[PDB]
Amino acid sequence: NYYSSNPTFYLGIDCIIFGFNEGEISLLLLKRNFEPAMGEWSLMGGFVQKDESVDDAAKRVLAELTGLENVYMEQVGAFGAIDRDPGERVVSIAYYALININEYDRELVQKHNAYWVNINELPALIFDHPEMVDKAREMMKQKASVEPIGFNLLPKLFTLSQLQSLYEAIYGEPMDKRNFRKRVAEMDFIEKTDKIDKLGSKRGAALYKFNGKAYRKDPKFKL
Amino acid sequence: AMKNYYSSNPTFYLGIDCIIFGFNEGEISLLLLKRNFEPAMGEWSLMGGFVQKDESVDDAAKRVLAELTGLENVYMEQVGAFGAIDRDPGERVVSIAYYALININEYDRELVQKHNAYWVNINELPALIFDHPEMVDKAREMMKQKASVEPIGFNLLPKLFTLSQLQSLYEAIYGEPMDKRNFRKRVAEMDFIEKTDKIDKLGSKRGAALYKFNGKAYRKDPFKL
């Protein structure tokens, strides 16, 4: 009764999907195999349905591309400039996700014509997607300094050089090897295993694990 | 082929909701509606509205705020998009919450009276309808974080303020007492907080030195207190 004199709008979802590999952060991007903007680069996206909450729409859109569930996700914001989408008025809610770049459904990715691209060497993204990406990076950077969300970008078992390399990539600057390793030593919820990562016959390094339960007993993450 | 790329999807009401912070006599307050309209007439809520066809989401938030307070060029931050299915039991509404910092000594009182709105101490709030309590919590958390790293607090104060008022404000932001001496030191070292030759006079017996925030000077060189 009360709300009907107001207009209604398409509610897009757009996903900034972060991955980490070989000292580089990358985004999972569509090279669109559909109109509008076929052939152009964009974030993975969709629309909110009547079935679902906005949060669940984000989960669904991410699962449609990657097959993943229970993904670490944060809402970035609601982008609502009038002409952000030239085809129609669409207000899009952006989310970012941190996934293990080693674990996703390769079939689904191939069928969406999607690609991992280094975050500092992105092609031109359509619409206001470049803007969304900028805001997502800034928020993730900020959160990753005060909370251990970084470990979602790594496999369950990781080495310290891998971990250092992650934080070097997040902040785009080198870190002192020595004192970084002391910060981890006195961080109790980062447990050292008896397993090693064996890249090759000449390469090995101790594998560590992130202990979620032990972190929440004392949420003192800072590095 | 893309003929129904858009139209195959549903459309939703886009709500606007404003958490409006004020500060006065050492307390942070929120400007709330005791609704004089339905739904939830007689219950307490945030100031609200809906995005229209001619306007962006941010401009909707400005408009809504202006409808209540008459204020423009207000410091505002988008809090988030709240899109749980049943947040509004009457109808499906995805609402985009904003917070605003205003000077409680300057607003349109008849506009506020028209909307039957009242300032309430943020620690002694009435029950708010729908998911408004969740919006306030998130807004408080965000505003607190931002105020430690940027000088957004000065929007809560008059152009001229005493260090006593400033300290009081930050004590209220952080809900804890601060060391008067160390606080004075951090303000003395900030060049963009200029001391004035004016004093705040309450009676003939009360006086205190007034200060000013110089945004120009600040943006030349950025704040931590």
Author numbering:
A (entry chain A): 3 to 225
B (entry chain B): 0 to 221, 223 to 225
Quote what the paper states about this structure.
In this study we identified and characterized a novel L-arabinose-responsive transcription factor found in the Bacteroides species, which belongs to the NrtR family of Nudix-related transcriptional regulators. The NrtR family transcription factors are characterized by an N-terminal Nudix hydrolase-like effector-binding domain and a C-terminal DNA-binding domain. In this work, genome-scale regulon inference using the comparative genomics approach revealed that the NrtR family AraR regulators in Bacteroides and Prevotella spp. control not only the L-arabinose catabolic operons, but also several other gene loci involved in the utilization of arabinose-containing polysaccharides. The predicted AraR-regulated operons are involved in the uptake and catabolism of L-arabinose and the decomposition of arabinose-containing polysaccharides (e.g., arabinan, arabinoxylan, pectic galactan) to oligosaccharides, their translocation into the periplasm, and further hydrolysis.
We determined the structures of full-length apo–BtAraR protein, its complex with a specific DNA duplex, and its complex with the L-arabinose effector. The solved structures provide a first view of the structural mechanism underlying the regulatory function of the L-arabinose-binding Nudix domain. The Nudix signature motif GX5-EX7REUXEEXGU (where U is a hydrophobic residue and X is any residue) is strictly conserved in all known active Nudix hydrolases, but it is impaired in the NrtR regulators of NAD metabolism, several of which are known to be enzymatically inactive. Similarly to NrtR regulators, the Nudix signature motif is not conserved in the AraR proteins from Bacteroidetes, where two or three glutamate residues are substituted with other amino acids. These observations suggest that AraR regulators are also enzymatically inactive and utilize their Nudix hydrolase-like domains for ligand binding.
